[PDB]
Amino acid sequence: GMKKKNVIVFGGGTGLSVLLRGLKTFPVSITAIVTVADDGGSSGRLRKELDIPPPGDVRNVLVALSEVEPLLEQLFQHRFENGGLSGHSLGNLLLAGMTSITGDFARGISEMSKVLNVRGKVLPASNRSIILHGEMEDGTIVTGESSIPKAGKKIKRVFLTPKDTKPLREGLEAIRKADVIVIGPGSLYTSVLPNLLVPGICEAIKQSTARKVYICNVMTQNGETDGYTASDHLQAIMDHCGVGIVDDILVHGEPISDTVKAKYAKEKAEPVIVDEHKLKALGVGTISDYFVLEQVLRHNASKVSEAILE
C-alpha cells in the first residue's frame, strides 16, 4: 500500500544503532552495512581466537532493529562479568556460534535476524575480517582499528587489507536499488571509511543516482580527528573516495550544554565546528539543525531520519 523508500546506511557501532532505532519507525526499507574491521574488546578476542569477523557492531545493529520481548533483548546484550568468559557479550557468542555452524557470517546474521524479528536487511561490509591500517603524517603505518587512535600521531589516511577484500553481492545490489544513501554517523577513520573503502563500494555509490547524505560527527575523537572542523571530515571522505559519494552534509549547527562539553573535554574531545563557507566550497548542500540529544551526546534519530527523507 505504501511505497517504502529504499534506504541504505553505512556505519559501525553506537551511531548507527541510535539512528536505526528511530529510522525503522518510518516508511522505509532499510539496509544496514556494518564495518567488520574492529579488533578491540570481546569482538576482537573472538575475531582473533575463532577466526571470524568481529561480531560486535553487527550485534548492536541487530538489537536496534529487533522486535522482541524486553527480556530476550537483555539476554542478547548480556555481558559476562566472571569466568576466559569474562568480558564477552552473549550476543557476540550467539553470532560466533551461528557463523561456525553455517561457515558464513552473512548467513549467520540473516538467521539471527529471523530470530530477532528484524525489520530490514543487515549485511557485513565483507564476509571476512578486514584489517584497518593508518598511515601517519610521518609515513609510518599503525595496524589495527583499536591501535590507530593510540598512536599519538596525526592520521594522513587509512586503508584496508586484504587487498582482495570483497563486499557481499547483496550489498552492491542494495546500493544499486537505493533511493537514499546515508553515510554515518560513526568514527570517520574507524567506521565510515572502513566501510566506504571496501573495493567496489565507492564505484557503486558513484553510479547511483540516489541522494547521498553524510551525517557529520558532532564531536572530535582523540587520536583520530583532533581539531577537525566539519569541512575537515568531508574533505577526508573526498580524499579517500573521490566524487559522487556525498551530495549533502548533515550537521548539528547549534550549541551544546557546557556540562556535556566539560565531560567530553576530559577525553580530549571537542565539538566539531561547522564551517559553512568551506562546506559550500566543497560543493555539497548543508542540512543544519538541532540534531543531538543528551542521553552522552547522541543524534536525534527522529529529526535526522525526517531530514534525510524530506
Ligand X SMILES: NC(=O)c1ccc[n+]([C@@H]2O[C@H](COP(=O)([O-])OP(=O)(O)OC[C@H]3O[C@@H](n4cnc5c(N)ncnc54)[C@H](O)[C@@H]3O)[C@@H](O)[C@H]2O)c1
Where does this chain touch ligand X (CB under 6 A) — which range of 9-17, 105-113, 229-237, 282-290? 9-17
Give the nearest distance from C-beta 289 to ligand X in angstroms: 13
Give the nearest distance from C-beta 218 to a second copy in angstroms: 33
Indicate whether 294 belongs to the interface with ligand X (CB under 6 A).
no
Grid cell of 231 as nine digits: 569541512
**Long-range contacts for 47-54 (Cβ within 8 Å, ≥24 apart)?**
47/129, 50/96, 50/100, 52/96, 52/99, 52/100, 52/105, 52/129, 53/99, 53/105, 53/124, 53/126, 53/127, 53/128, 53/129, 53/130, 54/129
Indicate whether 303 belongs to the interface with ligand X (CB under 6 A).
no
Nearer to a second copy, 2 or 71 (CB): 71
Indicate whether 182 belongs to the interface with ligand X (CB under 6 A).
no
Give the nearest distance from C-beta 149 to ligand X in angstroms: 10
Q: Tell me the C-alpha to C-alpha distance, in Å, between residue 180 and each of 29, 172, 176, 309.
A: 10, 14, 10, 8
Give the nearest distance from C-beta 66 to a second copy in angstroms: 14
Indicate whether 34 belongs to the interface with ligand X (CB under 6 A).
no
Which residues in the 64-83 window bind a second copy by CB under 8 A? 71-72, 74-75, 78, 80, 82-83
Which residues in the 95-134 window bind a second copy by CB under 8 A? 96-98, 100-102, 111, 115
Q: How far apart, in whole angstroms, are the C-alpha atoms of residue 276 and residue 198?
A: 30
> Would the annotation count 267 as a binding residue?
yes
- Residues 68-104, buried b or exposed e (16+ Cβ, 10 A)? eeeeeeeebeeeeeeeeeeebbbbbbbbbebbeeeee
Give the nearest distance from C-beta 188 to ligand X in angstroms: 7
Where does this chain touch ligand X (CB under 6 A) — which range of 36-44, 117-125, 217-225, 273-281? 217-225
Give the nearest distance from C-beta 263 to ligand X in angstroms: 4
Q: How many residues bind a second copy (CB under 8 A)?
A: 27
The residue type at 25: T
> Would the annotation count 127 as a binding residue?
no
According to CB under 6 A, which one of 56, 108, 185, 271 is a site residue for ligand X? 185
According to CB under 6 A, which one of 123, 218, 245, 308 is a site residue for ligand X? 218
Q: Tell me the C-alpha to C-alpha distance, in Å, between residue 57 and each of 104, 186, 242.
A: 17, 11, 26
Q: Can you say which residues are annotated as belonging to the binding site?
A: 14, 217-219, 263-267, 298-299
Binding site for a second copy (CB under 8 A): 45-46, 49-51, 71-72, 74-75, 78, 80, 82-85, 88, 90, 93-94, 96-98, 100-102, 111, 115
Q: Can you say which residues are annotated as belonging to the binding site for NAD(+)?
A: 14, 217-219, 263-267, 298-299
